[PDB]
Amino acid sequence: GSMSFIPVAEDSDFPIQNLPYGVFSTQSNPKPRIGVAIGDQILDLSVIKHLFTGPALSKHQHVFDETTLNNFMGLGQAAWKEARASLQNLLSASQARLRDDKELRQRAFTSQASATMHLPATIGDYTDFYSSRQHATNVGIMFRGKENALLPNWLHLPVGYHGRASSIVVSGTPIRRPMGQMRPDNSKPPVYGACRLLDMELEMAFFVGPGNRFGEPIPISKAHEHIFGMVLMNDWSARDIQQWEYVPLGPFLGKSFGTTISPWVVPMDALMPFVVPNPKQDPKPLPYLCHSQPYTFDINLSVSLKGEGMSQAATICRSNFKHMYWTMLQQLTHHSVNGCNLRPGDLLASGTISGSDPESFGSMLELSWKGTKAIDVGQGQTRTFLLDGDEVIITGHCQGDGYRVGFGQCAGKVLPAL
Amino acid sequence: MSFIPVAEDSDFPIQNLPYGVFSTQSNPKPRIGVAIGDQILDLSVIKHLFTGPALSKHQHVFDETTLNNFMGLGQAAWKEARASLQNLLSASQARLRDDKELRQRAFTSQASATMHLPATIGDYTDFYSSRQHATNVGIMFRGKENALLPNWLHLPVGYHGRASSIVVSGTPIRRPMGQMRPDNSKPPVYGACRLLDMELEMAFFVGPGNRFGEPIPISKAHEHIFGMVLMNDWSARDIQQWEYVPLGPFLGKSFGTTISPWVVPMDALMPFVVPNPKQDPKPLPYLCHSQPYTFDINLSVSLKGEGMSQAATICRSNFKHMYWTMLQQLTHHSVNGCNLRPGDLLASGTISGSDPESFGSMLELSWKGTKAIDVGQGQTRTFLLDGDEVIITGHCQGDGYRVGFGQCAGKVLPAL
Ligand SMILES: O=C(O)/C=C/C(=O)O
Ligand SMILES: O=C(O)/C=C/C(=O)O
Ligand SMILES: [Ca+2]
Ligand SMILES: [Ca+2]
Ligand code: NI
Ligand code: NI
Ligand code: NI
Ligand code: NI
Ligand code: NI
């Protein structure tokens, strides 16, 4: 461990080893600005921007005056590492520069309790993958039968689809049950009405840094230079609407009514101590997707559900990000192999995260096994799918020697349809 | 008529007046202009002339580098801007015609301007609304009996596209690399795309948009459609075939999608509206509208390869061959509460008529590579070859004038 002059609870998501980036505003000042979480405080980077005197940031101090992290993400590794080094030094209990500047400290720090979080960046494009082998197998079994669970292409390329960028909202934003077209009865015409199979999907997502030129692929050996950091995500899904609409062009309205992400972007540098070797892949991937660099992470994920009448939330899923079959490097490389241009601020999601144990399935579709099994939510209540008033809260932590790297929370409450 | 001379066969008479973003060598800063004859009227130069109630307090939208803010203003602003423009350009109006100095600063030649994307496209969606196109593709992949899947006639099927790779006319498109499975009994291979194709489409830009969680009722859909552009949704058929089940088109589409630069406003297209096609079964009430919103727009596609002196017209179709209207597409897209934003682009889907000469893709024109397309000069094509340039154009024929779209062009570059 190491320590900041700012007191940090040992169980805190935000010790000096984390230092995630976010966009916030306060009651006293409505302008969205860039900040870093430390303990129960937020360090305002627009206030201390002039302290970044290193080579990479000196000429670009204005990136900290922005209302989004896009420009900072676009700067690349050198700038990221320099910013992190400066912050760790500045927040160190041994450093006097900020610690002893009573006047500056007053203007630079704000309690997280007084802040309103905003989306961390302007997301140009959002892509959602389907990289959890257990998730894909479970869904495949439920809709195609065990014999035809995984389609022939799954084990050869990280399958994915373009999502809707506009409806990605920050943690805390209410999600309204969607209206749409469904076809419950195969022998009858479709009907218009409120979604009956509302579900959540536990995922993680990463932001793209520099990006590539239109027409130029990103070699897998260079992929790691384009990944800025991660956030938690809940890909809200209307299963019945999707089932009717999705053949043969894919998920559309069943996903676009809302997708929530946590507000604190945890930088890859903060996650490196928790890297583990990649899962063995068989069949072996084509050369362009082959890389030895370990890039699988040990991140404990928890999903809790709190009904409108419940006093305490119930943990309904405990999973881990290390259960993904395709790594982020393979996802980013595959995404640009045709020359598609990834841009700073773009968001690439992992896909629903499911482990082998039934308690680690990342969606209520899997947890209730297509509504055949009731999920015990405690105090005599059960669930198959989400009910109005239900609140889903996703959290994640990496456990190190004497500290934890957390993501804050990814929450949302379901509102009744119109 | 305008005091600005306009050739009789010009795409840009005073009845059109499309919006675009351009720049010049003198001034590299992208700015908003309107096409008239072979000139461009710089709106940032004449922004002070918009004195009406809807624009007087929003003249700054004309100083922007994109049309987004203007699109977001809504129909009252769009209509006021058009009325002012038609008044200022009419040969009988003195204001702009006689202010020589302003006149010299406001106009520039199209032949010396560089066009840019008209807006920052937040999200792009592509539909599958041409019945003949869907049937043709279905017949090739699933066979005659299962050409059209069950949901097709019930809702305007579509998918989210890739926004970053939408490029303006003239941008070269590099043949994409990727995974393909030519032999179903062997593992997939990595290599250059072999079935590169184009897709004739049209697309419209969204205006004001809706709040997150609030659907746009069909009766108000017409209020959110700003204008249209031509589009070529470049496609890598072999890459798509292997990747698309069950989540849809991905890398087979995202390597590039071209749009023309001039946004023709809906008001210029109204004189060419025709009754909507009969839908059977009739759609659910939320998708029903009586207002005609199908348009008579002649589309033409030419191809010119290396070693060819003249380009050959390989397709002649029309936008009226669409089953689902733009009003139905917009309404369906927001029915679940999804928030459409100014500048969003919604494409029609490949346009195919019943006539074989009107099929909007080479996949259809060559019938999956079984029929050779004669492009003249002893040359034939099934799919695109390196060096091939595809040019799409579209026109509405009025009495004594034409409303044109300029062109949607692109040349194929060899794979890296
Ligand atoms: O309908 C399909 O299966 C495919 C259509 C397409 O590739 O355009
Ligand atoms: O694999 C499928 O067919 C569907 C997957 C999903 O809806 O998540
Ligand atoms: Ca998902
Ligand atoms: Ca298309
Ligand atoms: Ni230590
Ligand atoms: Ni925590
Ligand atoms: Ni195989
Ligand atoms: Ni490196
Ligand atoms: Ni013309």
Short mmCIF file of C-alpha atoms in Angstrom, two decimals, chain A residues 28-259:
data_model
loop_
_atom_site.label_atom_id
_atom_site.label_comp_id
_atom_site.label_asym_id
_atom_site.label_seq_id
_atom_site.Cartn_x
_atom_site.Cartn_y
_atom_site.Cartn_z
CA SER A 28 -22.59 25.92 -6.20
CA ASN A 29 -21.32 25.51 -9.77
CA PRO A 30 -23.45 23.96 -12.59
CA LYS A 31 -20.66 23.63 -15.18
CA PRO A 32 -19.69 19.98 -15.78
CA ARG A 33 -15.98 19.54 -15.10
CA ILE A 34 -13.39 16.80 -14.85
CA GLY A 35 -12.58 15.30 -11.47
CA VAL A 36 -10.83 12.34 -9.89
CA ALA A 37 -12.22 10.37 -6.97
CA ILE A 38 -10.16 9.97 -3.81
CA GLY A 39 -11.70 8.66 -0.59
CA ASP A 40 -15.08 10.34 -0.23
CA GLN A 41 -13.83 13.43 -2.09
CA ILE A 42 -13.51 14.60 -5.70
CA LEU A 43 -10.38 16.46 -6.85
CA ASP A 44 -11.33 19.10 -9.45
CA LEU A 45 -8.76 18.93 -12.27
CA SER A 46 -9.85 22.24 -13.84
CA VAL A 47 -8.74 23.93 -10.61
CA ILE A 48 -5.29 22.29 -10.49
CA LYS A 49 -4.65 21.99 -14.26
CA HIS A 50 -1.70 24.40 -13.99
CA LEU A 51 0.17 21.88 -11.81
CA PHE A 52 0.61 19.49 -14.75
CA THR A 53 4.06 20.72 -15.76
CA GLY A 54 5.37 17.57 -17.43
CA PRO A 55 6.31 17.30 -21.15
CA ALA A 56 3.14 15.50 -22.31
CA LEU A 57 0.59 17.71 -20.53
CA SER A 58 2.20 21.17 -20.43
CA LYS A 59 1.05 22.06 -23.95
CA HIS A 60 -2.36 20.43 -23.41
CA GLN A 61 -3.58 21.69 -20.00
CA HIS A 62 -6.84 22.80 -21.61
CA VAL A 63 -8.07 19.20 -21.83
CA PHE A 64 -8.88 19.54 -18.12
CA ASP A 65 -11.17 22.52 -18.77
CA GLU A 66 -13.44 20.42 -21.02
CA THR A 67 -16.92 19.16 -20.12
CA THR A 68 -16.08 15.63 -21.36
CA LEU A 69 -13.05 13.32 -21.23
CA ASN A 70 -12.85 12.88 -25.04
CA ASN A 71 -9.86 15.15 -25.64
CA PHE A 72 -7.96 13.64 -22.71
CA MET A 73 -8.74 10.12 -23.98
CA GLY A 74 -7.50 11.12 -27.42
CA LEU A 75 -4.10 12.24 -26.08
CA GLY A 76 -2.78 8.69 -25.68
CA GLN A 77 -0.69 6.68 -23.21
CA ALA A 78 2.12 9.16 -22.60
CA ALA A 79 -0.33 11.81 -21.39
CA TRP A 80 -2.35 9.27 -19.36
CA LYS A 81 0.69 7.93 -17.53
CA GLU A 82 1.98 11.42 -16.87
CA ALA A 83 -1.35 12.61 -15.46
CA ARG A 84 -1.52 9.56 -13.18
CA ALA A 85 2.05 10.04 -11.93
CA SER A 86 1.40 13.72 -11.18
CA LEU A 87 -1.81 12.90 -9.30
CA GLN A 88 -0.26 10.12 -7.22
CA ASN A 89 2.56 12.45 -6.25
CA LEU A 90 0.22 15.39 -5.56
CA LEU A 91 -2.15 13.31 -3.43
CA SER A 92 0.67 11.55 -1.58
CA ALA A 93 0.78 12.08 2.19
CA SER A 94 4.48 12.96 1.85
CA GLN A 95 3.96 15.71 -0.74
CA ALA A 96 3.45 19.23 0.55
CA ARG A 97 2.53 21.09 -2.66
CA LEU A 98 -1.23 20.46 -2.50
CA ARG A 99 -1.43 19.09 1.06
CA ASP A 100 -0.17 22.32 2.65
CA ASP A 101 -1.83 24.77 0.28
CA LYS A 102 -4.90 25.48 2.45
CA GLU A 103 -6.29 27.96 -0.09
CA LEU A 104 -5.97 25.66 -3.11
CA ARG A 105 -7.27 22.59 -1.24
CA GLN A 106 -10.42 24.53 -0.43
CA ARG A 107 -11.12 25.23 -4.10
CA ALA A 108 -9.88 21.86 -5.39
CA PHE A 109 -11.80 19.32 -3.29
CA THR A 110 -15.54 18.64 -3.06
CA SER A 111 -17.45 15.93 -1.20
CA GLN A 112 -18.87 13.22 -3.47
CA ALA A 113 -22.11 13.65 -1.49
CA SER A 114 -22.46 17.16 -2.97
CA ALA A 115 -21.76 16.19 -6.59
CA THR A 116 -23.98 15.27 -9.52
CA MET A 117 -22.31 12.89 -11.96
CA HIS A 118 -22.66 13.21 -15.74
CA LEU A 119 -21.75 10.91 -18.62
CA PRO A 120 -17.91 10.88 -18.72
CA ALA A 121 -17.72 11.37 -22.51
CA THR A 122 -19.59 12.03 -25.74
CA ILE A 123 -19.95 8.46 -27.05
CA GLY A 124 -19.64 8.56 -30.83
CA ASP A 125 -20.43 4.87 -31.32
CA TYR A 126 -21.32 2.04 -28.97
CA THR A 127 -20.75 -1.65 -29.72
CA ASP A 128 -21.89 -4.59 -27.64
CA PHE A 129 -20.14 -7.95 -27.83
CA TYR A 130 -21.37 -11.47 -26.89
CA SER A 131 -18.11 -12.79 -25.41
CA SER A 132 -19.14 -14.85 -22.35
CA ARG A 133 -19.18 -18.51 -23.40
CA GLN A 134 -21.57 -19.55 -20.62
CA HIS A 135 -23.97 -16.70 -21.42
CA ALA A 136 -24.04 -17.57 -25.13
CA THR A 137 -24.46 -21.29 -24.34
CA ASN A 138 -27.29 -20.64 -21.82
CA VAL A 139 -29.22 -18.40 -24.22
CA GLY A 140 -28.55 -20.86 -27.05
CA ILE A 141 -29.94 -23.76 -25.00
CA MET A 142 -33.09 -21.82 -24.10
CA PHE A 143 -33.88 -20.79 -27.70
CA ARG A 144 -32.30 -23.48 -29.90
CA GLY A 145 -31.77 -26.53 -27.71
CA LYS A 146 -28.46 -27.76 -26.29
CA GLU A 147 -27.57 -29.42 -29.60
CA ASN A 148 -27.62 -26.07 -31.41
CA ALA A 149 -26.71 -23.71 -28.54
CA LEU A 150 -23.57 -22.10 -30.01
CA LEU A 151 -23.78 -21.16 -33.69
CA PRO A 152 -20.73 -22.15 -35.84
CA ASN A 153 -19.09 -18.69 -35.89
CA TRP A 154 -18.97 -18.03 -32.12
CA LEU A 155 -15.69 -19.83 -31.40
CA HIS A 156 -13.98 -18.16 -34.39
CA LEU A 157 -14.61 -14.45 -33.92
CA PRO A 158 -15.83 -12.13 -31.18
CA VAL A 159 -19.44 -11.70 -32.34
CA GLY A 160 -21.01 -8.30 -31.69
CA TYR A 161 -23.51 -5.71 -32.90
CA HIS A 162 -23.78 -1.91 -33.07
CA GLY A 163 -25.79 -0.51 -30.15
CA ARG A 164 -27.66 2.77 -29.71
CA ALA A 165 -25.45 5.59 -28.41
CA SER A 166 -28.12 8.19 -27.56
CA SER A 167 -29.82 6.05 -24.90
CA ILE A 168 -26.71 5.33 -22.84
CA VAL A 169 -27.42 7.09 -19.52
CA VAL A 170 -25.47 7.68 -16.32
CA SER A 171 -26.05 5.72 -13.11
CA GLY A 172 -29.18 6.85 -11.28
CA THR A 173 -31.28 7.60 -14.37
CA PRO A 174 -34.82 6.12 -14.19
CA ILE A 175 -35.63 3.61 -16.96
CA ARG A 176 -39.23 3.45 -18.18
CA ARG A 177 -40.71 0.06 -19.11
CA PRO A 178 -40.93 0.18 -22.93
CA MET A 179 -43.98 -0.10 -25.20
CA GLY A 180 -43.55 -2.06 -28.41
CA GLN A 181 -44.70 -4.80 -30.73
CA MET A 182 -44.67 -8.39 -29.39
CA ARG A 183 -45.95 -11.74 -30.61
CA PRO A 184 -46.73 -13.96 -27.58
CA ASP A 185 -49.11 -16.14 -29.56
CA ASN A 186 -47.49 -17.70 -32.61
CA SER A 187 -50.96 -18.43 -34.05
CA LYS A 188 -52.11 -14.80 -33.75
CA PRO A 189 -51.12 -11.35 -35.07
CA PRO A 190 -48.56 -9.32 -33.12
CA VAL A 191 -49.89 -6.93 -30.46
CA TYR A 192 -48.82 -3.49 -29.26
CA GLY A 193 -48.34 -3.01 -25.53
CA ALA A 194 -46.02 -2.78 -22.55
CA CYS A 195 -43.01 -5.09 -22.38
CA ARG A 196 -43.61 -8.09 -20.10
CA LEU A 197 -40.09 -9.53 -20.06
CA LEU A 198 -37.92 -6.64 -18.84
CA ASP A 199 -34.42 -7.78 -17.91
CA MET A 200 -30.97 -6.46 -16.98
CA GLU A 201 -27.62 -7.62 -18.36
CA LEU A 202 -24.45 -7.48 -16.29
CA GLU A 203 -21.58 -6.13 -18.43
CA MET A 204 -18.36 -4.16 -18.36
CA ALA A 205 -17.29 -1.73 -21.06
CA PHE A 206 -14.14 0.14 -22.05
CA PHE A 207 -13.51 3.51 -23.66
CA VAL A 208 -11.32 3.97 -26.71
CA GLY A 209 -8.40 6.39 -26.49
CA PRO A 210 -6.57 7.66 -29.66
CA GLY A 211 -8.33 5.45 -32.21
CA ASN A 212 -7.36 4.77 -35.84
CA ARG A 213 -7.49 6.40 -39.28
CA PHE A 214 -10.37 5.44 -41.56
CA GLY A 215 -9.22 2.40 -43.54
CA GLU A 216 -6.36 1.40 -41.23
CA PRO A 217 -6.67 -1.70 -38.97
CA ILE A 218 -5.27 -1.72 -35.44
CA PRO A 219 -2.69 -4.55 -35.09
CA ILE A 220 -3.35 -6.72 -32.04
CA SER A 221 0.16 -5.95 -30.75
CA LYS A 222 -0.82 -2.25 -30.57
CA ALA A 223 -4.40 -2.74 -29.33
CA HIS A 224 -3.49 -2.08 -25.68
CA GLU A 225 -2.39 1.47 -26.52
CA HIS A 226 -5.98 2.38 -27.45
CA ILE A 227 -7.79 1.27 -24.31
CA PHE A 228 -8.35 4.07 -21.84
CA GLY A 229 -10.36 2.64 -18.97
CA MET A 230 -13.48 0.78 -17.88
CA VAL A 231 -16.96 1.26 -16.43
CA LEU A 232 -19.78 -1.03 -15.28
CA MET A 233 -22.80 -1.39 -17.55
CA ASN A 234 -26.38 -2.63 -17.40
CA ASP A 235 -27.74 -3.36 -20.88
CA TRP A 236 -31.47 -3.15 -20.07
CA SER A 237 -33.33 -5.60 -22.33
CA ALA A 238 -36.97 -6.10 -23.36
CA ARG A 239 -36.79 -9.81 -24.28
CA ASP A 240 -40.27 -10.19 -25.78
CA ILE A 241 -39.85 -7.15 -28.04
CA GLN A 242 -36.45 -8.46 -29.15
CA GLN A 243 -37.62 -12.00 -29.90
CA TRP A 244 -40.17 -10.78 -32.45
CA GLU A 245 -37.97 -8.13 -34.10
CA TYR A 246 -34.45 -9.54 -34.21
CA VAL A 247 -34.40 -11.93 -37.16
CA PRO A 248 -32.41 -11.53 -39.28
CA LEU A 249 -30.80 -8.13 -38.62
CA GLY A 250 -30.25 -8.32 -34.85
CA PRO A 251 -31.25 -6.64 -31.55
CA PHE A 252 -32.88 -3.25 -32.12
CA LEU A 253 -35.73 -1.78 -30.00
CA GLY A 254 -35.26 -4.59 -27.48
CA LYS A 255 -32.02 -2.89 -26.38
CA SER A 256 -32.17 0.81 -27.35
CA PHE A 257 -34.65 2.11 -24.77
CA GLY A 258 -31.80 2.38 -22.29
CA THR A 259 -28.32 1.24 -21.27
#
